[PDB]
Design a protein around this ligand. Structure first.
Ligand SMILES: *[C@@H]1O[C@H](CO)[C@@H](O[C@@H]2O[C@H](CO)[C@@H](O[C@@H]3O[C@H](CO[C@H]4O[C@H](CO)[C@@H](O)[C@H](O)[C@@H]4O)[C@@H](O)[C@H](O[C@H]4O[C@H](CO)[C@@H](O)[C@H](O)[C@@H]4O)[C@@H]3O)[C@H](O)[C@H]2NC(C)=O)[C@H](O)[C@H]1NC(C)=O
Ligand SMILES: *[C@@H]1O[C@H](CO)[C@@H](O)[C@H](O)[C@H]1NC(C)=O
Ligand SMILES: *[C@@H]1O[C@H](CO)[C@@H](O)[C@H](O)[C@H]1NC(C)=O
Lengths: 48, 48
């Protein structure tokens, strides 16, 4: 029933950010779409 | 983790001629599989 998050902005191995007691089973995740006037082959060639 | 939820008698969720204008919900007696008792013994409530 506890959520745990680790991250790294430098190197590959992650380090502990935080833990959070929820008491409920998480069951889904979703990467939110990002809308932008940039980030495409016809404007800057960048990609998410 | 906590209880995922009480089982609902689905034959008590919605209304008999209910169209799409009404939203789905169940009456309070539709939730089953639970019970209660007092915690009181000798004028004190017992706690774990
Ligand atoms: C917790 O999260 C739930 C959703 O999961 C939220 O519940 C919803 O709340 C909204 C806002 O109260 C409900 O909105 C519906 O709006 C319809 C009209 O919208 C237009 O008009 C208004 C101005 O009047 C504009 O602001 C809006 O942008 C639109 O242009 C109403 O017609 C809906 O009415 C309901 O009841 C009547 C009968 O009285 C029926 O005829 C309708 O069909 C409908 O059932 C309603 O007001 C939305 O419906 C809610 N959804 C659910 C599933 O309940 C909670 O608000 C939120 N709570 C908190 C604290 O975060
Ligand atoms: C993106 O890259 C392609 C291939 O090199 C090129 O044809 C296109 O003009 C580039 N677009 C921009 C905005 O630089
Ligand atoms: C729901 O829709 C039906 C069909 O139009 C209508 O008979 C009924 O009165 C409506 N009920 C409500 C609560 O709007």
């Amino acid at each position: 029933g506890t959520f745990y998050a680790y991250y790294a902005d430098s190197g590959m191995p992650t380090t502990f950010l935080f833990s959070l007691y929820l008491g409920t089973l998480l069951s889904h995740y979703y990467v939110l779409p990002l809308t932008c006037n940039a980030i495409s082959s016809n404007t800057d060639n960048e990609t998410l | 983790e906590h209880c995922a939820g009480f089982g609902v008698d689905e034959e008590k969720c919605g209304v008999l001629d209910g169209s799409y204008n009404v939203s789905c919900l169940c009456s309070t007696d539709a939730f089953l599989g639970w019970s209660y008792d007092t915690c009181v013994s000798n004028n004190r409530c017992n706690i774990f």
